[PDB]
Design a binder for this molecule. Structure first.
Ligand SMILES: CC(C)[C@@H](OC(=O)[C@@H](NC(=O)CCC[C@H](N)C(=O)O)C(=O)S)C(=O)O
Ligand SMILES: [Fe+2]
Length: 329
């Protein structure tokens, strides 16, 4: 069979406080996990994930086909040319099983300077009718800020782990301009499950989504308690255990770029499982003009032979490339 990946559980609660020594001990754990498989579970994170799952289930099981067309991104509805990232991503019965709803920073309002300039990757969120989905928009916007708060604390741990001051990444992760996104993904139970919606890896493993590196600084993920993720290690693809009480954390390719691959973006994939489940990632993205000078924590002078890359350039190009490689979700 497949061996279990080493995915440690790290108590990240000291990253919310003022005990500097305790924060360094958490940073060492992040360093070790980032240098090994590239994944860890953040525990004692303070977020009510059971309520998140209940509110998301109420949304996914009540939205109708009519509402999905009315909220659809431009890949599914040509009338919505401004919706590249934010909105509904439809399933295609008999062909594509997954469906999802993506939303961005709630501060991207019609009057935001980047929305007025029509800067790529910035969009105003679209929401279903309040009478049909009472409390959903308010819950989802508050969830964005709850997971933003956890992600800021995690970024202080990564900064300390790399020998930097704790605001090294967090000073570029701000409420007024972050490009971070929440995706509410529904994987359905289907009987018969269409073979056209199942991909096959080179090793024969049935998949819902092929191998990739994440387009993010870090990825902060809540998932149902149904095992499905695998990570490629030197010993082959290994199964990541499920844990619906914690957040699964990993680095994206922007972190690999900035650290000269000291903290690699782990290659991973999603196995096909015939089960009704949820996958709720928060992609930690910086601001459009955020530029961090690349460095190398394995070199005495800390210098790297990589060129500075703005986060906006990285993100626009990365999202398109992932769709070309692994298909429109
Ligand atoms: C992480 C989970 C495993 C999940 O996978 C993802 O969400 C898939 N991300 C993308 O498609 C990028 C989506 C970007 C989003 N539209 C945006 O504009 O910011 C990855 O596999 S990462 C799942 O399939 O369960
Ligand atoms: Fe991923």
């Amino acid at each position: 069979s497949v061996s279990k990946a080493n995915v440690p559980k790290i108590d990240v609660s000291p990253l919310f406080g003022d005990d500097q020594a305790a924060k360094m001990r958490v940073a060492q754990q992040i360093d070790a996990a980032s240098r090994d498989t590239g994944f860890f579970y953040a525990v004692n994170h303070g977020i009510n994930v059971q309520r998140l799952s209940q509110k998301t289930k109420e949304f996914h099981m009540s939205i109708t086909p009519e509402e999905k067309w009315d909220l659809a991104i431009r890949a599914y509805n040509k009338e919505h040319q401004d919706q590249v990232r934010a909105g509904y991503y439809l399933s295609i019965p008999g062909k594509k099983a997954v469906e999802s709803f993506c939303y961005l920073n709630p501060n991207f309002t019609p009057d935001h300077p980047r929305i007025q300039a029509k800067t790529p990757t910035h969009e105003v969120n679209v929401w279903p009718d309040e009478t049909k989905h009472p409390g959903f928009q308010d819950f989802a916007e508050q969830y964005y800020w709850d997971v933003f708060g956890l992600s800021s604390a995690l970024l202080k741990g990564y900064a300390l782990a790399l020998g930097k001051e704790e605001n090294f990444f967090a000073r570029h992760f701000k409420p007024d301009d972050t490009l971070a996104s929440v995706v509410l993904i529904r994987y359905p139970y289907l009987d018969p499950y269409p073979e056209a919606a199942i991909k096959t890896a080179a090793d024969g493993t049935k998949l819902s989504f092929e191998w990739h590196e994440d387009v993010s600084l870090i990825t902060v993920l809540y998932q149902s308690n149904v095992q499905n993720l695998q990570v490629e290690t030197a010993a082959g693809y290994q199964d990541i255990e499920a844990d619906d009480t914690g957040y699964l954390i990993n680095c994206g390719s922007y972190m690999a770029h900035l650290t000269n691959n000291y903290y690699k973006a782990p290659i991973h994939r999603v196995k096909w499982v015939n089960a009704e489940r949820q996958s709720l990632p928060f992609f930690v993205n910086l601001g459009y003009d955020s530029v961090i000078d690349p460095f190398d924590p394995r070199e005495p002078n800390g210098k790297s032979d990589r060129e500075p890359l703005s986060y906006g350039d990285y993100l626009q190009n990365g999202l398109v490339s992932l769709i070309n490689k692994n298909g429109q979700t």
